[PDB]
A and B are shown apart, each in its own frame.
With several copies, the nearest count.
Chain A
Amino acid sequence: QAVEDFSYPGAAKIQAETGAILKRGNGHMLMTSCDGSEDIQVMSRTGQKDFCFNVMAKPAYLTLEVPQAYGIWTSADPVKTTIKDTDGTATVINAPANDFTGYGEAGSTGEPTTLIELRVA
């Protein structure tokens, strides 16, 4: 059936190729390459090390999961990021536009946290 379920298209292939997995979103965030088209960039020590996302419209969100994430680059927009610790506790970090911030591992706690939700203002 040609019905939109808001499940990330091609997520099955991405899991196999990049190691990252994706779930549900509002459809305005796409995974792409990091080659002169950078928008929101995520850096971890797993999978294929890194990958970029492109914002099609605002507001937007995509509940992707990236284990052992350590930092994010932003551009032309504030980014709201939710991460979770190994004890199941989640917290929210607000990253400013056009700058770099870190997570647990490269943050203040040193914890190997997981990316739970990436949201566009």
Chain B
Amino acid sequence: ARETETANLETRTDAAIERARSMKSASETSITASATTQVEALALNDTATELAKEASRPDIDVQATAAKGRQLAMQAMKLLGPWHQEAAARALSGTDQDVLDYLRTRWKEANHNDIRQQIVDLSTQSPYASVRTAAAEALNGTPEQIEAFHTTGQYTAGSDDMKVDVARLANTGGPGVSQAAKTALADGTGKTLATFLQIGQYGERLSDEKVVTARLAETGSPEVQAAAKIALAGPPELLHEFVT
């Protein structure tokens, strides 16, 4: 009876490992594709900057610029958000002089509108009261103040709250999280603290979780065993759920 139970457990587990194997690979593929798209979008903004300089350059050429500008607009409607999609469509539907104008000014306006967009988002979405309030104030100031908050002000405003959150993680998470939290805390830069709390700590818990699962996989009871091995074989989502 005991041999039968063992044989049946091993058979089911092996099948689960192969399925878990497949899911992990599928997840990685989607992640890579997403990252690729973001890179192209960033590259597009750099291209736009160079085109904006040429068009307004006093000695302009002959529609040559508009041709490049139309290509820029076409890409904008695929890689960038609504602010650029609208500006791009309007430029593309017009004449060379409108593409002239698009490159010179509203490209920049579309970026500005997006930044103001997230200042608005911060005023209600941010976990930090100091950031929500300060964002609301920045929103009603000058264009320079709106962008300034996005670039540095939000990291300063929430600095006091972030330090507390990092300090908490330092004294409760596992070796990975604790190690990283202490580094971020010791530095003290608002951007450093934000990076850790926003994404850094998540990479660290996965590390801590794998160690816990790895142990159970070897020294735990039979069914626990099997479950732990499957969790290691599959996506991060399975690892997290298993440990919890």
Interface residues of A (CB under 8 A from B): 35-36, 43, 45, 49, 70-71, 73, 100-102, 105-108
Contact B160 A102 (CB under 8 A): no
Which residues of B lie under 8 Å from residue A105 when comparing CB positions?
Answer: 164, 211
A102 touches B25 (CB 8 A): no
1/0 per residue, CB under 8 A from A, across B176-217: the answer is: 100000100110000000000000000000010011101101
Do A106 and B25 touch across chains, with their CB atoms under 8 A apart? no
Q: How many A-B residue pairs have CB under 8 A?
A: 63
Which residues of B have CB within 8 Å of A108?
219
Cβ A102 vs Cβ B229 within 8 A: no
Q: Max chain B CB contacts within 10 Å: which of A43, A45, A101, A106?
A: A106
Known: A36-B25, A107-B218, A108-B219. A102 touches B207 (CB 8 A): no
Quick check: A70 and B210 within 8 Å, CB to CB? Answer: yes
Q: A106-B164, A106-B167, A106-B168 are in contact. List 17 more A-B contacts (CB 8 A).
A: A43-B163, A43-B214, A45-B176, A45-B207, A70-B210, A70-B211, A71-B210, A100-B214, A100-B229, A101-B218, A102-B170, A102-B214, A102-B218, A105-B164, A106-B211, A106-B218, A107-B218
Say whether B125 faces chain A, with CB atoms less than 8 Å apart. no
Q: Is B47 an interface residue (CB 8 A)?
A: no
Q: Is the interface of B mostly helix, strand, loop or mixed?
A: helix
A116 to chain B, nearest CB (A): 19
Most B CB contacts (10 A, CB to CB) among A36, A70, A71, A108 go to: A71
In the complex, are the beta carbons of A106 and B207 less than 8 A apart? no
CB<8 Å pairs between A and B, sample of 27: A43-B163, A45-B160, A45-B164, A45-B211, A49-B160, A49-B207, A70-B163, A71-B185, A71-B232, A73-B186, A100-B214, A100-B217, A100-B218, A100-B232, A101-B218, A102-B170, A102-B217, A105-B164, A105-B211, A106-B167, A106-B168, A106-B171, A106-B215, A106-B218, A107-B168, A107-B218, A108-B219
